[PDB]
Amino acid sequence: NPDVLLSRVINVVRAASSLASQDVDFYKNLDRGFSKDLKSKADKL
């Protein structure tokens, strides 16, 4: 069904738009494990 699952895509589209909006490199400095979790969340991707 289009209107359901794409609304869930739009939900994650905005969340994807919500992702690299913050400065992300600063805790990649403060640990690898931030970056590695960001790597692990990219492993979902």
Binding site: V13, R14, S17, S21, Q22, D23, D25, K28, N29
Partner: protein, 978 residues
């Protein structure tokens, strides 16, 4: 709230062996030519020695059992020969006799013929069949009647005429093999030897696809012969072949000269006649420079002199057909046959006209040319009739016609030798430019003069009309063998039948296409470099500590966080209202050339008066000038322009031990590294030779005042910049302020040096894969992107499934090669010929069978033009999707690929018009008409195929109805050699 606007919002933001060259040298009878001195140094016999080269090498499969062919004692002359054969020919026939394929690449006069003569009988005595190749019918017509006289039992295969289909020996043109390699002639199944002549036409950007692919389509059992003009890069071919059919292949190079050549320069209306290249192939500078001196119609002096010199025959070369006809008239007051010979001319000539109808025995163009032909004079170009084309060359070969006015066919048209070659136009049009002719062009355009057993020498005479550059006349005449590389492209009928034949693929063609041999050769060298780089990397690869990587990972976080701040330090609507003279400032232009600490001369803005609409940065329209004492002594102080930051080179700081001076540079806000908080005496005296040098010593006195460091204008405390954007930005460094100092061995255990220990590993970490990306980028078939677009096309056309299974639509043009197969399916699938008559649709078939543009035809009778308007409507939508295919084809230019002008003449030959009458309706020469007429039969016959495959019974009634109405009187032309 369109559903792509969520993309738009801003978020919520906080092999080589048997390699030898051999030498061969003989003596030649003396000759002076038309220079009155001898051409070379004489020997004691009155002879003149020449010498030439015999290279041999062979390409190797891996692990192959090799014995040297120089040792190969040939047990039997499978063809014996009357005279002494040559050493490379001796080297040649052993390769045939021992049974491996071989390229020999020589000139046509050398005797490459003789090697082809041998393998026939070795095929014949083993009852094998053999293919002799040619690009031209008349090349075969030479070789056929020759071999027909020689061995007799030889099959000829031509689009014009087949003779004796089940003979033992076969002579045929290139595409017929390709055609009978697609549908698998069993004719092939008794063939073990192939004679490829004219191999270098693989670099034909027009047709060279055929020679390349057909060799790829060979079974690997077969032995092969390869004959072509001398190329320097012959081995590449053998290096290509020996893998892809997996058997050895020899090479033989020579540069041999059969009859000896003498190059002369005639300035048009100049009177110097200068041997500038001897038979020993030496550039005479001085004769050329005398020819440079002797440069201050003209032919008519030259020829009777040559006729006084008795250097008949003589061949004139234009760069266009019409020029010869002019040059025919510029010479025609002479005569060079006896009336016995002119009776011998005319009587035999009428036998040439005997094979025409008596109505055709009075055709106008032949009436005109015949008195020139009576005058011992001939012209060569395509535009004549083929019956005209053959009779001349005969009489040329039988020497009645001392003169030939020729173009580039007769350059390729061999077995018709000359004594004297005339270069009337030095340059020549190459499709793009009337260019200075390149080397192997001229070398191919050289050797045609000089009969082997008869002519003493070769006479080379070039008329020039420019004082040419010296290396160009070298690069033309002291020439180079031109490089032979694949002109492989794609074509859709090929794309058809490789799906239609099951066993192989079009991709498979690309795996063995020579067009990527560029992508073959240099890469193992770079692999060797990679095999080097994968080793040198392994030396520094492990340091003492892992944390130095993490320190570099800290340093990676260090290096970027300083990077982002300086572009915010260099703020465009800042470093402003603080730029006053004497304010002590740190100077580092653009992040490229750091100039220490200086004092502001002034601040200004660059005004662009010459270009109103250009862009400077809001940094860079602002011009600051600053005295530094960090200027190098030998910088071009006089060459930098005031208030322009365009600094030339040599302007730099004083390097290690170099003398520092003071100078003033125009700088912008990008040059500002930082700005301090002190103001010394900045002189209102601008430039009086020692106020900028008092700045720098005062800078040195300020370098006495703060030798440690100037308190910089803090954006917090001094410039009072208070932005939550700006202040939170520094926090990235405010970890590095902490954490770098916090880390164990920040610089203990020589970690600074151990950084470079890591870094020299880390650079090797970078640059191999950087190279290895390039090599992995240097892998694949680059043509797939073309092909993958063409895979779209037929699916868009419905010629096959997306599972690539060919439809009946695509099954149509399987017997179509002779035209646009992409269009011709759709026209018949648009069925517009149901109400076309045989006179009507034939004019539409004139829209295919001919390419070269000419004068405008009128807008014809619209029952032609409206179908012509109809087919034009079809191909656009086709080319539309081709434009949609990312296939870079101009749809407009794709239409004028179709030429629509002879349709009237086509419409009237359908109505039984006279050949005489229709000659009036064009400038296009009469054979060229027949060259599309006999093309048009090949079309209509392949059109007869289609309704058989569809069942359009009306069409089949209509198809041969056309074929009746074209195939007739003058279209029935046959040749004389056959």
């Amino acid at each position: 709230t369109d559903l792509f606007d969520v993309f738009e919002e801003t978020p919520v933001e906080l092999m080589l062996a048997d390699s030898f060259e051999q030498e061969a040298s003989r003596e030649v009878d003396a000759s002076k030519g038309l220079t009155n001195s001898e051409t070379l140094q004489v020997e004691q016999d009155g002879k003149v020695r020449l010498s030439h080269q015999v290279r041999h090498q062979v390409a190797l499969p891996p692990n192959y059992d090799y014995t040297p062919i120089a040792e190969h004692k040939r047990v039997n002359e499978a063809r014996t020969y009357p005279f002494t054969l040559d050493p490379f020919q001796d080297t040649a026939i052993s390769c045939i006799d021992r049974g491996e394929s071989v390229l020999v690449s020589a000139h046509t006069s050398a005797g490459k013929t003789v090697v082809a003569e041998y393998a026939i009988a070795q095929s014949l005595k083993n009852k094998q069949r053999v293919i002799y190749t040619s690009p031209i019918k008349a090349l075969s017509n030479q070789k056929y009647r020759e071999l027909l006289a020689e061995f007799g039992d030889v099959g000829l295969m031509t689009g014009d005429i087949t003779i004796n289909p089940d003979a033992g020996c076969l002579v045929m043109t290139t595409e017929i093999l390709r055609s009978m390699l697609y549908r698998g002639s069993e004719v092939m199944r008794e063939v073990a030897w192939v004679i490829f002549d004219e191999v270098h036409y693989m670099r034909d950007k027009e047709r060279g696809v055929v020679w390349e692919e057909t060799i790829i389509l060979l079974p690997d059992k077969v032995r092969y012969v390869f004959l072509s003009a001398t190329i320097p890069n012959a081995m590449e071919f053998a290096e290509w072949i020996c893998k892809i059919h997996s058997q050895p292949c020899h090479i033989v190079y020579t540069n041999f000269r059969p009859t000896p050549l003498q190059h002369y320069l005639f300035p048009a209306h100049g009177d110097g006649i200068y041997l500038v290249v001897d038979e020993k192939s030496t550039f005479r500078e001085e004769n050329f420079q005398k020819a440079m001196a002797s440069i201050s119609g003209d032919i008519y002096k030259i020829v009777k002199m040559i006729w006084k010199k008795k250097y008949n025959p003589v061949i004139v070369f234009s760069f266009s057909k019409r020029d010869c006809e002019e040059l025919a008239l510029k010479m025609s007051k002479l005569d060079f046959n006896s009336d016995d010979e002119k009776e011998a001319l005319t009587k035999i000539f009428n036998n040439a006209i005997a094979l025409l109808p008596e109505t055709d025995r009075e055709l106008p163009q032949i009436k005109h040319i015949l008195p020139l032909l009576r005058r011992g004079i001939g012209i060569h170009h395509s535009g004549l009739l083929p019956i005209l084309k053959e009779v001349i060359e005969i009489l040329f070969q039988e020497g009645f016609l001392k003169v030939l006015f020729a173009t580039e066919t007769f350059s390729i048209g061999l077995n018709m030798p000359a004594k004297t070659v005339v270069f009337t136009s030095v340059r020549k049009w190459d499709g793009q430019q009337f260019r200075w002719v390149s080397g192997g062009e001229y070398i191919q355009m050289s050797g045609r003069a000089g009969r082997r057993g008869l002519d003493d020498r070769g006479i080379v005479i070039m008329m020039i009309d420019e004082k040419m550059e010296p290396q160009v006349a070298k690069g033309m005449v002291k020439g180079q063998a031109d490089r032979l590389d694949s002109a492989f492209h794609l074509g859709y009928n090929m794309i058809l039948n490789l799906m239609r034949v099951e066993g192989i693929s079009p991709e498979f063609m690309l795996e063995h296409s020579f067009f990527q041999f560029q992508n073959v050769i240099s890469v193992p060298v770079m692999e060797k470099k990679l095999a080097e780089l994968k080793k040198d990397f392994d030396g520094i690869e492990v340091e003492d500590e892992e944390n130095v990587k993490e320190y570099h990972e800290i340093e990676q976080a260090i290096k970027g966080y300083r990077e982002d701040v300086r572009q915010v330090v260099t703020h465009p609507a800042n470093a402003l209202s603080f730029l006053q003279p004497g304010r002590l400032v740190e100077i580092s232009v653009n992040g490229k050339d750091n100039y220490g600490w200086g004092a502001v001369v002034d601040f200004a803005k660059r005004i662009n008066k010459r270009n109103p609409s250009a862009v400077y940065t809001d940094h860079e329209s602002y011009i600051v000038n600053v005295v530094v004492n960090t200027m190098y002594i030998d910088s071009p102080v006089n060459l930098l322009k005031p208030f322009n930051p365009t600094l030339p080179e040599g302007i730099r700081p004083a390097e290690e031990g170099e003398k520092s001076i003071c100078a003033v540079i125009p700088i912008t806000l990008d040059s500002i590294k930082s700005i301090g908080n002190l103001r010394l005496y900045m002189p209102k005296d601008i430039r009086a030779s020692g106020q900028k040098e008092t700045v720098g010593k005062s800078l040195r006195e300020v370098n006495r005042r703060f030798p440690d460091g100037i308190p910089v204008l803090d954006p917090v405390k001094n410039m009072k910049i208070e932005d939550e954007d700006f202040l939170k930005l520094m926090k990235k460094i405010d970890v590095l302020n902490t954490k770098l100092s916090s880390n164990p061995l920040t610089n203990s255990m020589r970690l600074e040096e151990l950084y470079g220990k890591y870094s020299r590993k880390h650079d090797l970490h970078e640059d191999m894969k950087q190279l290895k990306r390039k090599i992995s980028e240097s892998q694949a078939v680059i043509q797939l992107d073309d092909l993958r677009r063409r895979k779209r096309v037929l699916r868009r056309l419905g010629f096959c499934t997306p599972n690539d299974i060919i439809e009946l639509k695509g099954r149509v043009a399987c017997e179509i090669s002779s035209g646009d197969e992409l269009l011709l399916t759709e026209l018949i699938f648009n069925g517009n010929f149901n109400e076309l008559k045989p006179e009507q649709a034939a004019a539409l078939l004139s829209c295919f069978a001919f390419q070269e543009r000419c004068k405008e035809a009128p807008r014809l009778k619209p029952e032609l033009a409206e179908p012509l308007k109809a087919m034009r409507e079809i191909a656009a939508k086709i080319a539309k999707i081709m434009k949609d295919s990312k296939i870079e084809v101009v749809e407009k230019d794709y239409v004028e690929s179709f030429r629509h002008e002879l349709m009237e003449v086509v419409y009237e030959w359908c109505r039984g018009a006279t050949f005489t009458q229709i000659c009036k309706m064009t400038d296009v020469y009469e054979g060229s008409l027949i060259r599309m007429f006999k093309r048009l039969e090949e079309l209509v016959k392949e059109l007869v195929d289609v309704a058989n495959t569809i069942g359009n019974s009306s069409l089949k009634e209509k198809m041969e109805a056309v074929l009746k109405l074209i195939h007739r009187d003058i279209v029935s032309a046959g040749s004389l050699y056959l």
